[PDB]
Scaffold this active site. Structure first.
Site, PDB file in Angstrom:
ATOM      1  N   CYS A  33      15.788  21.301 -33.722  1.00 27.85           N
ATOM      2  CA  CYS A  33      17.087  20.632 -33.588  1.00 27.85           C
ATOM      3  C   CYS A  33      17.658  20.799 -32.178  1.00 27.85           C
ATOM      4  CB  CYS A  33      18.056  21.199 -34.602  1.00 27.85           C
ATOM      5  SG  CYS A  33      19.639  20.348 -34.613  1.00 27.85           S
ATOM      6  N   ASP A  48      20.831  21.025 -31.493  1.00 20.62           N
ATOM      7  CA  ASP A  48      22.024  21.923 -31.579  1.00 20.62           C
ATOM      8  C   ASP A  48      21.623  23.321 -32.034  1.00 20.62           C
ATOM      9  OD1 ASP A  48      22.443  22.269 -34.698  1.00 20.62           O
ATOM     10  OD2 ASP A  48      23.343  20.251 -34.515  1.00 20.62           O
ATOM     11  N   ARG A  64      20.193  27.026 -30.945  1.00 21.51           N
ATOM     12  CA  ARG A  64      20.943  27.826 -29.935  1.00 21.51           C
ATOM     13  C   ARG A  64      20.009  28.755 -29.158  1.00 21.51           C
ATOM     14  NH1 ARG A  64      26.305  27.037 -32.556  1.00 21.51           N
ATOM     15  NH2 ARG A  64      25.622  26.635 -34.706  1.00 21.51           N
ATOM     16  N   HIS A 108      17.392  25.285 -38.737  1.00 22.28           N
ATOM     17  CA  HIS A 108      18.239  26.468 -38.497  1.00 22.28           C
ATOM     18  C   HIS A 108      19.459  26.296 -39.380  1.00 22.28           C
ATOM     19  CE1 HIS A 108      21.147  24.709 -35.440  1.00 22.28           C
ATOM     20  NE2 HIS A 108      20.373  23.747 -35.920  1.00 22.28           N
ATOM     21  N   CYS A 144      23.620  24.201 -38.856  1.00 23.46           N
ATOM     22  CA  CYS A 144      23.072  23.005 -38.177  1.00 23.46           C
ATOM     23  C   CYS A 144      24.173  21.963 -38.181  1.00 23.46           C
ATOM     24  CB  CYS A 144      21.840  22.452 -38.891  1.00 23.46           C
ATOM     25  SG  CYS A 144      21.235  21.014 -38.047  1.00 23.46           S
TER      26      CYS A 144
END
Ligand SMILES: [Zn+2]
Ligand SMILES: [Zn+2]
Lengths: 207, 214
Positions: B49, B51, B53, B105, B108
């Site tokens: 993804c 987003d 981290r 994750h 999300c």
């Protein structure tokens, strides 16, 4: 298959080092931090954005694709840009290319790569938009390097053409768009000095 | 429309950081970048993804150079998306990658945004793929009463469906027949703990399940 165990063991060691080296890293990571940057880079580039930029991961919303493209009708990249601008209110968008880019190299070789052809066609269109410039560079390596730079510049132009970036910049004076080249030989970022304001006006002419 | 000066100052801050970072790496090893720019082809394709981290190679403790990476909103592999399908085809047919990982994750923003009724305009068709995963597993998800546990289960099912979509590609099927690679894995990254979990996707069972219709 032993590869699986190797990764899980590395993940556990990384968690231990991170806990020992930084006390609140997971707490900070699990806390919300809104990223200031959208980075569009290449899948085959060799170092993550936040390392190159010396930011903490969490500060960069990331998209990577073959040859760091922003094609007009690609919903994958357009949804990244729309989310970054309208949901994350990101202040910077970067397109970052890199020398020794297998995606750009693959685009120039005359093979039928089936499903890859329409993707890499975007790079061949950058070549045709700048045919005189590129054909005037006699050294294959310097020509290839110039193509990587022109590809970044055209990807940047495509970001500036999105309604998301144009409407946000008109109403709120962000985000700005930059084109960068990462050089693996030295590890240094070079700015291509895309003139955002000039390019934005150039594009708004129609209307 | 003029560019606010504070947006120009951010630029110089990043280039300073980059110089400092290059100085550090030349301290450690004078030939770090010389080595890095000679390194061999990656063995892993990571789909994650946008987003999320922490970068893949950090999570996995690999040197970057070892992971070919795609990141998109909610780590999707939609059937007609040429962006992700060209990543998968390049990774298999050009890089001869041995592993493909789809990594989701918890927390999300992509998957969260898919369930919120807002009209996202251009985002609606992309996030529709997540809503399709929910419909495919509606009775399971509707029977989970805690909102957080339901959302976590959706993230896991999204990874499993992204994995199924990879295994449907001709590139993966042909390569796996000829050479017994790549294999596809579904992982979840938990930011609260830093730990990877394997969703244990059963590649061979899924591969057979998919080949049935033909
Ligand atoms: Zn590349
Ligand atoms: Zn996410």
């Amino acid at each position: 298959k032993q590869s699986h165990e190797r990764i899980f063991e590395n993940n556990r060691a990384w968690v231990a080092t991170k806990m020992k080296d930084d006390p609140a890293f997971f707490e900070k990571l699990s806390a919300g931090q809104t990223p200031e940057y959208l980075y569009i880079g290449c899948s085959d580039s060799r170092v993550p954005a936040n390392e190159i930029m010396g930011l903490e991961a969490g500060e960069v919303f990331v998209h990577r694709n073959i040859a760091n493209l922003v094609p007009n009708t690609d919903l994958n990249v357009m949804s990244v840009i729309n989310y970054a601008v309208r949901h994350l209110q990101v202040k910077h968008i970067v397109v970052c290319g890199h020398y020794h880019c297998g995606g750009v190299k693959a685009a120039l070789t005359p093979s039928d790569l089936g499903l890859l052809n329409p993707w890499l066609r975007n790079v061949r269109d950058v070549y045709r938009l700048h045919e005189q410039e590129l054909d005037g560079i006699q050294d294959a390596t310097a020509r290839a390097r110039r193509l990587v730079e022109l590809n970044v510049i055209e990807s940047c132009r495509n970001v500036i053409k999105t309604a998301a970036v144009q409407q946000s910049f008109h109403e709120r004076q962000f985000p700005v768009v930059h084109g960068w080249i990462f050089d693996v030989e030295t590890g240094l970022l070079r700015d291509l000095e895309i003139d955002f304001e000039e390019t934005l006006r150039d594009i708004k002419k129609i209307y």
